[PDB]
Amino acid sequence: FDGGSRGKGEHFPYEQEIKFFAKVVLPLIDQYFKNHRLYFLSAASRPLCSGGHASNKEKEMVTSLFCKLGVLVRHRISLFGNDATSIVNCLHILGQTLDARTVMKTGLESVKSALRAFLDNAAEDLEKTMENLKQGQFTKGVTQIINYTTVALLPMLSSLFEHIGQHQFGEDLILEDVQVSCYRILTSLYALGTSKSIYVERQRSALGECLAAFAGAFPVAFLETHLDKHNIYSIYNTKSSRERAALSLPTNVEDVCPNIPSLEKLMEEIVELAESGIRYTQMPHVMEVILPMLCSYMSRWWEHGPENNPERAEMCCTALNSEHMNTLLGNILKIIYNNLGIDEGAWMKRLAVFSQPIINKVKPQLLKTHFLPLMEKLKKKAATVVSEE
Amino acid sequence: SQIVLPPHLERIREKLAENIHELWVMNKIELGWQYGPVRDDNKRQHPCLVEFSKLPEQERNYNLQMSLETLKTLLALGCHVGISDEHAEDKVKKMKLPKNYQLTSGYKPAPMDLSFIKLTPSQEAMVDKLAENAHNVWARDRIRQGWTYGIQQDVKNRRNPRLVPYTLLDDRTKKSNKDSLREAVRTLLGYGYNLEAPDQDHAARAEVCSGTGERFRIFRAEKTYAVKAGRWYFEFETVTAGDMRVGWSRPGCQPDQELGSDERAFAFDGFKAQRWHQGNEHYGRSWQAGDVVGCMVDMNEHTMMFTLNGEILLDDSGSELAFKDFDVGDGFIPVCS
Ligand SMILES: Nc1ncnc2c1ncn2[C@@H]1O[C@H](COP(=O)(O)OP(=O)(O)OP(=O)(O)O)[C@@H](O)[C@H]1O
Numbered sequence: 001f002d003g004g005s006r007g008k009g010e011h012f013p014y015e016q017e018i019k020f021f022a023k024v025v026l027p028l029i030d031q032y033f034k035n036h037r038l039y040f041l042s043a044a045s046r047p048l049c050s051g052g053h054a055s056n057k058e059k060e061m062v063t064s065l066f067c068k069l070g071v072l073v074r075h076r077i078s079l080f081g082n083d084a085t086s087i088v089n090c091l092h093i094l095g096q097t098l099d100a101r102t103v104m105k106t107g108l109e110s111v112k113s114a115l116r117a118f119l120d121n122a123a124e125d126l127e128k129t130m131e132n133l134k135q136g137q138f139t140k141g142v143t144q145i146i147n148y149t150t151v152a153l154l155p156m157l158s159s160l161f162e163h164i165g166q167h168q169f170g171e172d173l174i175l176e177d178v179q180v181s182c183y184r185i186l187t188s189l190y191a192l193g194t195s196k197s198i199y200v201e202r203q204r205s206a207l208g209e210c211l212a213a214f215a216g217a218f219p220v221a222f223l224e225t226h227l228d229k230h231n232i233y234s235i236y237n238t239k240s241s242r243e244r245a246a247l248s249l250p251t252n253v254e255d256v257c258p259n260i261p262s263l264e265k266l267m268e269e270i271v272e273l274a275e276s277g278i279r280y281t282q283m284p285h286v287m288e289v290i291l292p293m294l295c296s297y298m299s300r301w302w303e304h305g306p307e308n309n310p311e312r313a314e315m316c317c318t319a320l321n322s323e324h325m326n327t328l329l330g331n332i333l334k335i336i337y338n339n340l341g342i343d344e345g346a347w348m349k350r351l352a353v354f355s356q357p358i359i360n361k362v363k364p365q366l367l368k369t370h371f372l373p374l375m376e377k378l379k380k381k382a383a384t385v386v387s388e389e
Numbered sequence: 390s391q392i393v394l395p396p397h398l399e400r401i402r403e404k405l406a407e408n409i410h411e412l413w414v415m416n417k418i419e420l421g422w423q424y425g426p427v428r429d430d431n432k433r434q435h436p437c438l439v440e441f442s443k444l445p446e447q448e449r450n451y452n453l454q455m456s457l458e459t460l461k462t463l464l465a466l467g468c469h470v471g472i473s474d475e476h477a478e479d480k481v482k483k484m485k486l487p488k489n490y491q492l493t494s495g496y497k498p499a500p501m502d503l504s505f506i507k508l509t510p511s512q513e514a515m516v517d518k519l520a521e522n523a524h525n526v527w528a529r530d531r532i533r534q535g536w537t538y539g540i541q542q543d544v545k546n547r548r549n550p551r552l553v554p555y556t557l558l559d560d561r562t563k564k565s566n567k568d569s570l571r572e573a574v575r576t577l578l579g580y581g582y583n584l585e586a587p588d589q590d591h592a593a594r595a596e597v598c599s600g601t602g603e604r605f606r607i608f609r610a611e612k613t614y615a616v617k618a619g620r621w622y623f624e625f626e627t628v629t630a631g632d633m634r635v636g637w638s639r640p641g642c643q644p645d646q647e648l649g650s651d652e653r654a655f656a657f658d659g660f661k662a663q664r665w666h667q668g669n670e671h672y673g674r675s676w677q678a679g680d681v682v683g684c685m686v687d688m689n690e691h692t693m694m695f696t697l698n699g700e701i702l703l704d705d706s707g708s709e710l711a712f713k714d715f716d717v718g719d720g721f722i723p724v725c726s
Pocket residue numbers: 527
């Protein structure tokens with residue numbers, strides 16, 4: 001039908017069959033997977049000890065289904081009769097039901113290549129979105145690819161990154177050639193969150209929530225590059241030197257990630273803007289883009305921090321500390337304190353839901369006289385309509 | 390006997406068995422056995438150093454039957470029998486060995502470079518099962534001969550400490566025969582005729598055959614200590630982690646019935662993170678070894694609460710009450726299963 005769309009005949013011969021597909025096959029897939037979240041997760045790995053083993057064959061078939069339906073949703077939103085919402089809901093559910101350890105540990109090579117091709121095509125799709133949007137600021141193929149990107153590309157990558165992060169599965173999934181695409185997506189999303197346009201004004205939220213999921217999903221501390229070489233899992237160590245020369249790799253972390261700043265630099269602009277106390281409406285980009293990295297970054301790499309493991313110290317992948325926390329989260333607190341008086345906003349609700357586990361992470365002896373000010377300030381600001389928790 | 394032996398195996402094993410015998414004589418003479426016409430085991434003297442044809446026919450029989458039981462056991466394990474490639478019989482790499490590692494005669498000690506092939510852990514477990522089976526066969530042979538287990542080795546009384554289960558078997562002997570079997574099955578792999586072993590997956594009912602017919606024992610206080618008013622507390626320490634339930638019981642609880650299965654007990658299952666009263670629901674989390682569960686009953690508000698290491702357990706909702714409302718009845722006493 002993509003071929004015959006340019007043809008004069010617009011009467012699709014199997015419209016009945018494609019409507020049966022959309023109305024029946026996809027929703028029954030949805031209900032089955034939603035009734036059975038965990039059966040696919042139960043592969044004798046201890047979840048559902050009563051049984052419910054999902055075979056390895058079943059799981060690569062699930063992965064192939066996911067990849068092929070992603071191929072269907074590629075640039076076909078117009079052909080879909082508004083069912084793209086159902087498409088992306090099934091995208092979610094198959095995302096949560098994915099099992100990356102088992103699928104990568106044992107898998108068929110065509111499914112392997114299909115998943116890698118899917119992630120590469122998604123990455124280059126958002127890349128060409130980047131390129132066209134930034135080269136052209138004048139106002140229908142371009143707007144069609146843009147709204148396709150906003151509607152489908154961001155939610156699917158967000159769902160994949162989220163299930164990866166909340167499982168801690170997917171680290172072995174991102175082992176080779178996934179990381180080049182992941183750096184491309186990182187540079188691209190950072191450029192979206194840095195640039196200003198009516199489009200990014202429309203999706204304030206999407207580009208501020210995708211980065212948080214990407215940080216949690218991604219297993220390499222790109223912020224702390226000083227000890228990144230010394231992580232054995234690093235692709236820099238993996239690629240030897242001959243494979244660098246064969247591939248198109250800059251062989252340097254600073255060369256391959258020049259746009260993203262250092263962790264100390266993010267921290268120092270966070271401190272500067274907190275002490276400045278500017279209104280939310282001069283430069284919302286920072287507390288909607290950098291802050292998700294703070295929350296998600298630190299949430300992901302606590303246990304990978306050297307502090308938790310005195311054994312294997314300074315050869316951990318990151319460098320995290322309770323003193324970092326007492327600095328950065330207090331910085332968040334000062335930001336929310338000084339900006340409660342100006343323009344309020346639901347972005348603080350979004351930050352609260354993101355940082356809900358962070359208060360659990362912080363010790364009770366670190367709650368006292370630190371978060372109690374938050375309680376007394378929130379009840380003192382009864383004049384302000386905003387309430388938290 | 391019930392398994393049949395395939396044609397590829399039947400015409401390739403003669404070579405496999407002679408290869409295994411050659412490797413056996415080679416690693417023994419390398420670990421230090423020399424040649425001698427006179428037969429002596431303490432003086433490491435082997436009258437059977439000759440080839441399989443000049444080898445004693447009984448020992449050649451032992452070699453054939455050991456490779457039989459090897460491949461037959463491999464098939465019985467569920468091996469997906471299939472042809473891999475004739476490429477290894479086409480091309481094989483013989484190494485050049487220095488005289489120090491060489492033997493006195495001109496035999497080729499290492500026909501194949503054993504190093505480059507690495508054995509999968511799933512494959513490794515099956516070689517462990519092969520060692521288990523061989524040890525059991527030897528043990529039953531000893532039992533047929535009349536040998537029995539003893540703490541001390543004595544041939545006169547036919548006592549052998551080695552007649553123990555392989556898990557209980559001594560580390561040195563078990564690793565020695567384990568590495569010899571490594572070598573045998575691994576050169577079997579190295580001839581390129583690698584049998585396609587089954588994908589090792591574990592899923593089982595997992596030993597419900599517990600000792601005796603008892604599934605649980607219930608410990609309770611005397612019926613005379615039943616409380617009908619006030620606020621009461623006691624602690625329950627879990628030395629281990631497993632199927633244990635703690636809570637409050639009515640004076641009519643039945644010793645043979647599980648706590649909470651009926652209306653006469655209110656219990657908390659920490660093995661499944663469940664609360665039990667006329668059925669099971671989801672409540673709290675699971676304990677570990679050494680965890681202490683505090684049991685709390687309030688008879689004038691008819692409420693029950695539980696703690697794990699001090700913190701109060703929660704229901705599916707935010708409620709802190711394990712059981713919201715119940716009648717006083719004849720009272721309650723501490724109970725644990
Ligand atoms: N005739 C044999 N020659 C060598 N090994 C044998 C023989 N018969 C069986 N085996 C295998 O080797 C093991 C011991 O054989 P071997 O004659 O080398 O004894 P050992 O290790 O020196 O000690 P032990 O005196 O305790 O038998 C047996 O348990 C069996 O697995």
